[PDB]
Amino acid sequence: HVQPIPPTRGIIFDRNGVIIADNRPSFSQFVRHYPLKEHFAHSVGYVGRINEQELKNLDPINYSGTHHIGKTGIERFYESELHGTVGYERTDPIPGKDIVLSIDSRLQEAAENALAGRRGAIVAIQPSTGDVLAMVSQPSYDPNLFVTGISFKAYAELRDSIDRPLYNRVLRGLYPPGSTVKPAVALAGLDAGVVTPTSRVFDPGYYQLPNYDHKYRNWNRYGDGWVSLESAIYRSNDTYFYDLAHKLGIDRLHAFMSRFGFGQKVALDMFGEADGLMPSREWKRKTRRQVWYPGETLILGIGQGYMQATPIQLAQMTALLANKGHWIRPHLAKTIDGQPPVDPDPMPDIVLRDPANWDRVDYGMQQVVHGARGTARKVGATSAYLIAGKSGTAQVRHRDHALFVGFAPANNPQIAVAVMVENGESGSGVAAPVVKQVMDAWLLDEHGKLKAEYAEPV
Numbered sequence: 001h002v003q004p005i006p007p008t009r010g011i012i013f014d015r016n017g018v019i020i021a022d023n024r025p026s027f028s029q030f031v032r033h034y035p036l037k038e039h040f041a042h043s044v045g046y047v048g049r050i051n052e053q054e055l056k057n058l059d060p061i062n063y064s065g066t067h068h069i070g071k072t073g074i075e076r077f078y079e080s081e082l083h084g085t086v087g088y089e090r091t092d093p094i095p096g097k098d099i100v101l102s103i104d105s106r107l108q109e110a111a112e113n114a115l116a117g118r119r120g121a122i123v124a125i126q127p128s129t130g131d132v133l134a135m136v137s138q139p140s141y142d143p144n145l146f147v148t149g150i151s152f153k154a155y156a157e158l159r160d161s162i163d164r165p166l167y168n169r170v171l172r173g174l175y176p177p178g179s180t181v182k183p184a185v186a187l188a189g190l191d192a193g194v195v196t197p198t199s200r201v202f203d204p205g206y207y208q209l210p211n212y213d214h215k216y217r218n219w220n221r222y223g224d225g226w227v228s229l230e231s232a233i234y235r236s237n238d239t240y241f242y243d244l245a246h247k248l249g250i251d252r253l254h255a256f257m258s259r260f261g262f263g264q265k266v267a268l269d270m271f272g273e274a275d276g277l278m279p280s281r282e283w284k285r286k287t288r289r290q291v292w293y294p295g296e297t298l299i300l301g302i303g304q305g306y307m308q309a310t311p312i313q314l315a316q317m318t319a320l321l322a323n324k325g326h327w328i329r330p331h332l333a334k335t336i337d338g339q340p341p342v343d344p345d346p347m348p349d350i351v352l353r354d355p356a357n358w359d360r361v362d363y364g365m366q367q368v369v370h371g372a373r374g375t376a377r378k379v380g381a382t383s384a385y386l387i388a389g390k391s392g393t394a395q396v397r398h399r400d401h402a403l404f405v406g407f408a409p410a411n412n413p414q415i416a417v418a419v420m421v422e423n424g425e426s427g428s429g430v431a432a433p434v435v436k437q438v439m440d441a442w443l444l445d446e447h448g449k450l451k452a453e454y455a456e457p458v
């Protein structure tokens, strides 16, 4: 008599080879094991028993003897590769393909530590390679409770908590990116030619389009005076980008911010990534069926309105500013079966008509943290490396979310981080120190100094 044999699920490693997912022996068959538990619930995901629906959507041959299936995260997206082929009693089953993740969990743990128990999300990207060095969504849960079947009570402890431990804030958490988009908006205006690196704008504390008497007010009521590209970035002036978005138009704004990855998903291998929203004139005609008003473009110049962005879309934009426009999609899976995965649908690189604008916007982001009048100047006083970042706030009872993106070292980008702290208020005061703690753990040795590898200038 012949009898089928199930295959063993592929092992999951981090970027340094620490095991993220084993298989443990049980009797009356292997169970999947997550030896780091909550530190990867939203990155790797988990597996569970196979339901009524997914059984009529799986090979009865290859999945014979396989009673569990990927549910979310990496286990699902690469369920095919991690599964394998069955054997027969001896045709031996070929074990599932092993996956090496890009995440360094010495940075994943340091990021969760930097979040300090607050609800939110942290995403770290290596801009030259696209490796997702960290993917953090707080709070967490133990993925080892669904592998065997989770008690309908313990599920409720997850489901009926208002902190939402099941919410993957990195992938399905959509927030108005706020002031953090202003570097990309500046590049949109600089590219079109409506604004030049030295062209000035007087800030009386408000902006009016040449038709209405209505005033679009600056976050500083009394104004910043004459502001240029750099002054507009390290002070995050709203009137400068009110004026920039006006002279640019939403037709060429939505097109530019789309090439930065806003609108649809950015990553290569992230299950259930929300597209986000980059509003255009065609969207509002479909969705709301009303003509686009020129006042709706000005709120977009400072990252507001109906615009929706996921914390990974933000981090990819941060890596893009670090990468000088070379488009490489973020990806968790570093290698599959020992070779890196290939992007089937790449994104075109962002080729500016004056490539020096990259260094000018980066220098504006650079003075955000280190300038004498930067919003996050206190963060730069405690730094051993140059940080080209920018703080912001998201729009929302309770307060509003604090945001801060940034890459470092500014002159040789090795890390790109985007942080969203729920109800943090001060992008400069809470979200900025979290980036610097995440960036510190990646760049600093264990004695507080910058690593030898990253110090040399290029």
Ligand SMILES: *C(=O)N1C[C@H](NOS(=O)(=O)O)CC[C@H]1C(=O)NNC(=O)[C@@H]1CCNC1
Pocket: 178, 179, 180, 217, 218, 219, 236, 238, 302, 375, 376, 391, 392, 393, 394, 425, 426, 427, 428, 429
């Ligand atoms: C961007 O989101 N803004 C710029 C400020 N810089 O962030 S931080 O606090 O330095 O870290 C933060 C506030 C936010 C802002 O409010 N910008 N201005 C507006 O939204 C209009 C002025 C008041 N009504 C809207």
Ligand SMILES: [Cl-]
Pocket: 374, 375
């Ligand atoms: Cl200030």
